[PDB]
Design an enzyme around this catalytic site. Structure first.
Site, PDB file in Angstrom:
ATOM      1  N   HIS A  38       0.807  -1.204   0.000  1.00  0.00           N
ATOM      2  CA  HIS A  38       0.000   0.000   0.000  1.00  0.00           C
ATOM      3  C   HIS A  38       0.846   1.264   0.000  1.00  0.00           C
ATOM      4  CE1 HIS A  38       0.099  -0.216   4.584  1.00  0.00           C
ATOM      5  NE2 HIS A  38       0.340   1.066   4.390  1.00  0.00           N
ATOM      6  N   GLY A 140       3.025   5.579  10.250  1.00  0.00           N
ATOM      7  CA  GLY A 140       4.381   5.378   9.791  1.00  0.00           C
ATOM      8  C   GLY A 140       5.010   4.076  10.251  1.00  0.00           C
ATOM      9  N   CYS A 142       4.012   1.014   9.431  1.00  0.00           N
ATOM     10  CA  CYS A 142       3.864  -0.097   8.497  1.00  0.00           C
ATOM     11  C   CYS A 142       5.216  -0.575   7.980  1.00  0.00           C
ATOM     12  CB  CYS A 142       2.957   0.312   7.327  1.00  0.00           C
ATOM     13  SG  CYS A 142       1.253   0.411   7.918  1.00  0.00           S
TER      14      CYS A 142
HETATM   15  C1  LIG Z   1       0.975   2.200   7.997  1.00  0.00           C
HETATM   16  O1  LIG Z   1       1.972   2.862   8.701  1.00  0.00           O
HETATM   17  C2  LIG Z   1      -0.371   2.462   8.651  1.00  0.00           C
HETATM   18  C3  LIG Z   1      -0.334   1.997  10.168  1.00  0.00           C
HETATM   19  C4  LIG Z   1      -1.550   2.363  11.004  1.00  0.00           C
HETATM   20  C5  LIG Z   1      -1.790   3.883  11.174  1.00  0.00           C
HETATM   21  C6  LIG Z   1      -2.247   4.116  12.636  1.00  0.00           C
HETATM   22  N1  LIG Z   1      -1.903   2.859  13.309  1.00  0.00           N
HETATM   23  C7  LIG Z   1      -1.490   1.827  12.458  1.00  0.00           C
HETATM   24  O2  LIG Z   1      -1.178   0.734  12.785  1.00  0.00           O
HETATM   25  N2  LIG Z   1      -1.417   1.749   7.931  1.00  0.00           N
HETATM   26  C8  LIG Z   1      -2.647   2.332   7.601  1.00  0.00           C
HETATM   27  O3  LIG Z   1      -2.946   3.451   7.893  1.00  0.00           O
HETATM   28  C9  LIG Z   1      -3.671   1.430   6.829  1.00  0.00           C
HETATM   29  C10 LIG Z   1      -3.483   1.648   5.316  1.00  0.00           C
HETATM   30  C11 LIG Z   1      -4.398   0.781   4.471  1.00  0.00           C
HETATM   31  C12 LIG Z   1      -4.364   1.197   2.960  1.00  0.00           C
HETATM   32  C13 LIG Z   1      -4.124  -0.712   4.607  1.00  0.00           C
HETATM   33  N3  LIG Z   1      -5.015   1.830   7.264  1.00  0.00           N
HETATM   34  C14 LIG Z   1      -5.326   1.971   8.588  1.00  0.00           C
HETATM   35  O4  LIG Z   1      -4.643   1.449   9.442  1.00  0.00           O
HETATM   36  O5  LIG Z   1      -6.433   2.731   8.936  1.00  0.00           O
HETATM   37  C15 LIG Z   1      -6.901   2.611  10.287  1.00  0.00           C
HETATM   38  C16 LIG Z   1      -8.316   3.129  10.552  1.00  0.00           C
HETATM   39  C17 LIG Z   1      -9.441   2.335  11.166  1.00  0.00           C
HETATM   40  C18 LIG Z   1      -9.563   2.650   9.717  1.00  0.00           C
HETATM   41  C19 LIG Z   1     -10.698   3.417   9.071  1.00  0.00           C
HETATM   42  C20 LIG Z   1     -10.687   3.551   7.657  1.00  0.00           C
HETATM   43  C21 LIG Z   1     -11.652   4.253   6.933  1.00  0.00           C
HETATM   44  C22 LIG Z   1     -12.732   4.891   7.581  1.00  0.00           C
HETATM   45  O6  LIG Z   1     -13.688   5.599   6.862  1.00  0.00           O
HETATM   46  C23 LIG Z   1     -14.477   4.970   5.858  1.00  0.00           C
HETATM   47  C24 LIG Z   1     -12.756   4.786   8.990  1.00  0.00           C
HETATM   48  C25 LIG Z   1     -11.765   4.079   9.692  1.00  0.00           C
END
Ligand SMILES: *[C@H](O)[C@H](C[C@@H]1CCNC1=O)NC(=O)[C@H](CC(C)C)NC(=O)OC[C@@H]1C[C@H]1c1ccc(OC)cc1
Ligand SMILES: [Cl-]
Lengths: 298, 299
Positions: A38, A140, A142
């Site tokens: 991603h 950050g 990931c």
């Molecule tokens: C990478 O560093 C990041 C790590 C997360 C950020 C905060 N804590 C972590 O562990 N990864 C992400 O942000 C991933 C990315 C995706 C494309 C896989 N996404 C999330 O971790 O989002 C977390 C939120 C609960 C999610 C959410 C998403 C969308 C919403 O609205 C429709 C509401 C809530």
């Protein structure tokens, strides 16, 4: 005491990976950097990313990889499930002996949390039965990895990808396959009902005994099946005969038959703590395996 | 909230083993000096009440076997500084990090790299209790394992392990060999003072709760520092120092809650109990997270 593996062999593999305005961590082994795919996404992509389509539109030079002060030139890239594999022109001289493993729920591993390719902290996690992990990960993080170490060999089992709305965490093995029913899209995802890892609770109760704490013991016993009926009622995982066997050493060391400890745990599940504590905790701890407990008492 | 250790690699690169006769423990190799507990020179018979000065006079450089792995490091000088031995060696450690030696205060936390025979086994976070013991996970052969914090490039070494007490808690020195607390390196039964709760860390934990939106316990009142300290002592809580007030500064600024107002909230919890409520999903107040630990984890 929750003990993590020493993290030095993994620290020497952490790098920073940037694509566009997204930065996260990668794992640099020999001449390949592994990272969450991603990283190639933008906002207009997050909700339903067609990753093969997004990736074919990228060039080697769209990937900025930094190991400390040094940029590593990407000479090739491929995708394996949810992991991107970036080929670079330099081999990591600090690459440890390693393998990639996929761990089972209930097993434990250490996490090296990193930000911008820099190690920040290390801690022990367990793979939950619902295939989440209760981690401490921020923006950050990931590409941070989870691992175990046996002799000279680092077994990588986890790469971090996301947080769920409940605050638990989800990710992949190093082949890029998620643990659990989760997907690397920016959507609010729920996990299945979690359960407690029973063989680990039992190991931790033996630990409390070894260390002189034994107020929860009792004179009673139980059959395996009757224990499992009560366990399942309280959303504890079933205990298998292999679990009983695995607990032998701790049973021997303390002279407490496994099914006797099962009777004590049953009493705790039905009665509660009476407001007391075990090994300091007010809750039954389930992220120490029998191996963990043994090694730290050896 | 979980105990998070510092990455251990910079300290792993400094661990060696030091043997005198059949007694082996761990040492810390920085530049061309190896630091280790002086009781390495004791036989299991000198340990009852060792005459360390007399024992050291009988030793020579060539009696010390220092190894990094299987590779011997030749000793070219030796001296004793309080309860630590300094062995000058003929090779400067190429993995020496930027470092300093610091003496921490009760309540401060640090990571321990538990080692056996110069080989790291695990890393975990410890807090120095007000009675100057830590609740470690140390077995035979762990002596010379060190505790540390990392700031930017720099490893601040604060603890070196020497002994276990009858109660199973652990005691040791700073890297200048000065014990924390009223302990000596002799194989005699020694008792720690009654332990107390680390108030500054509980306050840090309440600030963390507020940052995460869990703030039912905030009340309208305030207190003086002296009044709070006198009450806290009746509940086996440590009194606060000026330095404690200062290190809560950043969390007070982040939340807009004055330190002394949070003290008044804690005082109400002490006097009235939790009334069945939880804070950060716990009916117990946590005292092993410092104000810096809260910042580390939440950012
Ligand atoms: C990478 O560093 C990041 C790590 C997360 C950020 C905060 N804590 C972590 O562990 N990864 C992400 O942000 C991933 C990315 C995706 C494309 C896989 N996404 C999330 O971790 O989002 C977390 C939120 C609960 C999610 C959410 C998403 C969308 C919403 O609205 C429709 C509401 C809530
Ligand atoms: Cl005052």
């Amino acid at each position: 005491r929750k003990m993590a593996f020493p993290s030095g062999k993994v620290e020497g593999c952490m790098v920073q990976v940037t694509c566009g305005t997204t930065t996260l961590n990668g794992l640099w082994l020999d001449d390949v950097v592994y990272c969450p795919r991603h990283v190639i996404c933008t906002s207009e992509d997050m909700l339903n990313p067609n990753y093969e389509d997004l990736l074919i539109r990228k060039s080697n030079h769209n990937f900025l990889v930094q190991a400390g002060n040094v940029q590593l030139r990407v000479i090739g890239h491929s995708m394996q499930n949810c992991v991107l594999k970036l080929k670079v022109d330099t081999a990591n001289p600090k690459t440890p002996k390693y393998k990639f493993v996929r761990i089972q729920p209930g097993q434990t591993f250490s996490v090296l949390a990193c930000y911008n390719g820099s190690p920040s902290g290390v801690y022990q996690c367990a793979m939950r039965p619902n295939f989440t992990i209760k981690g401490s990960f921020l923006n950050g993080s990931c590409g941070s990895v989870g691992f175990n170490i046996d002799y000279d060999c680092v077994s990588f089992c986890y790469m971090h990808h996301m947080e769920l709305p409940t605050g638990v965490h989800a990710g992949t093995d190093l082949e890029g396959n998620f643990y659990g029913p989760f997907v690397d899209r920016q959507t609010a995802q729920a996990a299945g009902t979690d359960t407690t890892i029973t063989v680990n609770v039992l190991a931790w109760l033996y630990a409390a005994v070894i260390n002189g704490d034994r107020w929860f013991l009792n004179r009673f016993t139980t059959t395996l099946n009757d224990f499992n009926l009560v366990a399942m009622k309280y959303n504890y995982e079933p205990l298998t005969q292999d679990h009983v066997d695995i607990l032998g050493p701790l049973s021997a060391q303390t002279g407490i038959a496994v099914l006797d400890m099962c009777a004590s745990l049953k009493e705790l599940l039905q009665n509660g703590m009476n407001g007391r504590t075990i090994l300091g905790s007010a809750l039954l701890e389930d992220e120490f395996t029998p191996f963990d407990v043994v090694r730290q008492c050896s």
